[PDB]
Amino acid sequence: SPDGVRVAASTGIDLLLLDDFKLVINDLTYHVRPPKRDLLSHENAATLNDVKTLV
Amino acid sequence: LVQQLYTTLCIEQHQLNKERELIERLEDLKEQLAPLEKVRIEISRKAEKRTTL
Structure with missing residues (x-):
């Protein structure tokens, strides 16, 4: 993840590609910046995220 | 919620926009057809005359 947190071995790619993320090879930290493609109002994204769990 | x-999210508008796209695309399918429609309807009429003969 953009900070010390590392992603799992199960997170779906799109769930990852949502934002930047450092990819580490054997001895280097390649710093990926994927193209911003969320395309949804964050608040609206939130109020939907609220729904999904609430269901 | x-x-x-x-x-x-103007979804109701998007819903219309969804259909409005489809009905339009269908018109395109009809548009490509009108030119080649008349040519077969002869070859139908022609191959019909030779059959009713």
């Missing part, structure tokens, strides 16, 4: 989500 979903209703607030509904109105806040």
Whole structure:
């Protein structure tokens, strides 16, 4: 993840590609910046995220 | 929430826009057809005359 947190071995790619993320090879930290493609109002994204769990 | 989500995303408009696209695309399919429609309806009429003969 953009900070010390590392992603799992199960997170779906799109769930990852949502934002930047450092990819580490054997001895280097390649710093990926994927193209911003969320395309949804964050608040609206939130109020939907609220729904999904609430269901 | 979903209703607030509904109105806040102009979905009703998008719904129309969805269909409005389809009906338009169908018109295109009809448009390509009109030229080649008349040519077969002869070859139908022609191959019909030779058959009713």
